[PDB]
């Protein structure tokens, strides 16, 4: 007596998978009553997803409702989890199990399958250019010189822009093409390059300059941003 699972694999967000849970050594009862799916994200605990229950009432977790469907074909002695509109957070080992269905007081899950791994990913980053900003935050006083650095993981020529974002507001372009100031930007902002390091300098920090600053490369698509440097008051 066991449940054997198949169908897991690697998909991108928005994709679909169909997991199968084949029963061996016993017959699923009426309409697969009691068949249940549970998942376990890497390093995490168990999460109940769905159970075929009495009176044509399939039960689902809020985390999968409207995207996943549990069903069973007793003719084929197999149950299924149809998984539509997959998301990165659905990455997990997926288990099926048979919940006890002979007594109202015991629905515990037994005969758990070996699990099938589902990985939902848009990629590990691949060849995308990574922009590394340093420091990630700093506190300084009005009048201080502030220097923020941004390293490109590969050649980007001089195709680097700097933005400022204040809390609750949209980003504003400060400097483009490494060192050219956008109109209206105060002269205390300047940009430079030394090797693969790009620097935004504020020569004398003013009260209105507390903000988060971001670099951005446009040498290649995808356009990528540094993680940001928050400049705060001491």
Sites of contact with a copy of itself (CB under 8 A): 12-14, 36, 38, 45-48, 51, 53, 59-63, 65-67, 84-85, 87-89, 95, 100, 105-110, 112-115, 122-126, 128, 158-159, 161, 163, 165, 169-173, 176-177, 180, 182, 214, 216, 218, 221-228
Measured from the CB atom, is 198 or 214 closer to a copy of itself?
214
CB of 49 to a copy of itself, least distance (A): 9
Task: State which residue, 157 or 204, has the beta carbon closest to a copy of itself.
Answer: 157
Nearer to a copy of itself, 106 or 208 (CB): 106
Comparison of 7 and 171: residue with beta carbon closer to a copy of itself = 171
Min CB(75)–a copy of itself separation in Å:
26
Residue whose CB is less far from a copy of itself, 121 or 204: 121
Rounded Cα gap, residues 199 and 226, in angstroms: 12
In the complex, the smallest distance separating the C-beta of residue 27 from a copy of itself, rounded to whole angstroms, is 19
Instruction: Give me the long-range contacts of 216-222 (CB less than 8 A, separation at least 24).
Output: 216/131, 216/160, 216/161, 216/162, 216/163, 217/129, 217/131, 217/152, 217/156, 217/159, 217/160, 217/161, 218/159, 218/160, 218/161, 219/129, 219/152, 219/155, 219/156, 219/157, 219/159, 220/129, 220/156, 222/128
Q: Radius of gyration (Cα) for the chain, nearest Å? A: 27
Shortest Cβ distance from residue 59 to a copy of itself (Å)? 4
């Amino acid at each position: 007596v066991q449940l054997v699972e198949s169908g897991g694999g690697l998909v991108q967000p928005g994709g679909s998978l169909r997991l199968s849970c084949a029963a061996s050594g016993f017959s699923l009862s009426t309409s697969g009553i009691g068949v249940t799916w549970v998942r376990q994200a890497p390093g995490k605990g168990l999460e109940w997803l769905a159970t075929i229950w009495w009176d044509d009432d399939n039960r689902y977790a809020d985390s999968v409702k409207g995207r996943f469907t549990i069903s069973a074909d007793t003719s084929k002695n197999t149950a299924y989890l149809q998984m539509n509109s997959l998301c990165a957070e659905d990455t997990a080992v997926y288990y099926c199990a048979q919940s006890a269905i002979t007594s109202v007081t015991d629905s515990a899950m037994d005969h758990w399958g070996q699990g099938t791994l589902v990985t939902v990913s848009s990629g590990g980053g691949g060849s995308d250019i990574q922009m590394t900003q340093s420091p990630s935050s700093l506190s300084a006083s009005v009048g201080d010189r502030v220097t923020i650095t941004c390293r490109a993981s590969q050649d980007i020529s001089s195709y680097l822009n700097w933005y400022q974002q204040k809390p609750g507001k949209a980003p504003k372009l400060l400097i483009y093409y490494t060192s050219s100031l956008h109109s209206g930007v105060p002269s205390r902002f300047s940009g430079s390059r030394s090797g693969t390091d790009f620097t935004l300098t504020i020569s004398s920090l003013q009260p209105e300059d507390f903000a988060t600053y971001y670099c951005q490369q446009y040498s290649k698509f995808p356009w990528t941003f540094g993680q940001g440097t928050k400049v705060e008051i001491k």
